[PDB]
């Protein structure tokens, strides 16, 4: 039972580590994506204002 539970604990906690790593990368990606969305929005608005002034 010690052998079996050692294997189970190792695999389960490695899986938990992988899952929390997935959460870390996911939240970092979400922050990067929303910041990128803001950047693209302001760039598009700058382009539109410049287009109005060019007209």
């Amino acid at each position: 039972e010690q052998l079996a539970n050692a294997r189970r604990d190792y695999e389960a906690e490695i899986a938990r580590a992988r899952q929390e790593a997935a959460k870390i990368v996911a939240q970092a990606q979400e922050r990067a994506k929303q910041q990128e969305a803001e950047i693209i929005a302001q760039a598009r608005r700058e382009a539109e204002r410049l287009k109005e002034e060019a007209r």
Partner: protein
């Protein structure tokens, strides 16, 4: 990269009926059926989303070097899309490395085979 793709797809096309309702096949016919379905799902691409040469090279390298075998059939388009997103973000240096030496006679250089197989392994372990 594409010779193995073309050959495997041709073999799968030859093996048509067996895939779809012959159930008494070994894992020699069925292996080709599986791999051909993998490659065919790989070619399914949306509209207005072209892939540069290094992207297709990386995806077909992953598919033809057995790195995609464990992926189930319906999820392969998402696997390709996720691997590309990982490749844009997690490792742009490997994309640059592929694109710089796409013209050499022996493309799978050890510098390229490394850092591409490494990226594939990283994506496989991190995701699913």
């Amino acid at each position: 990269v594409a010779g193995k793709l073309k050959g495997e797809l041709a073999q799968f096309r030859d093996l048509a009926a067996f895939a779809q309702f012959a159930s008494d096949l070994d894992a020699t016919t069925k292996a080709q059926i599986e791999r051909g379905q993998r490659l065919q799902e790989l070619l399914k691409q949306p509209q207005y989303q072209p892939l540069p040469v290094e992207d297709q090279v990386a995806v077909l390298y992953a598919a033809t070097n057995n790195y995609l075998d464990d992926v189930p059939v319906p999820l392969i388009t998402k696997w390709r899309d996720d691997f590309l997103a990982f490749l844009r973000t997690a490792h742009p240096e490997v994309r640059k490395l592929i694109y710089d030496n796409r013209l050499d006679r022996k493309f799978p250089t050890p510098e390229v085979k490394e850092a591409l197989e490494a990226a594939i392994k990283e994506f496989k372990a991190t995701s699913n």
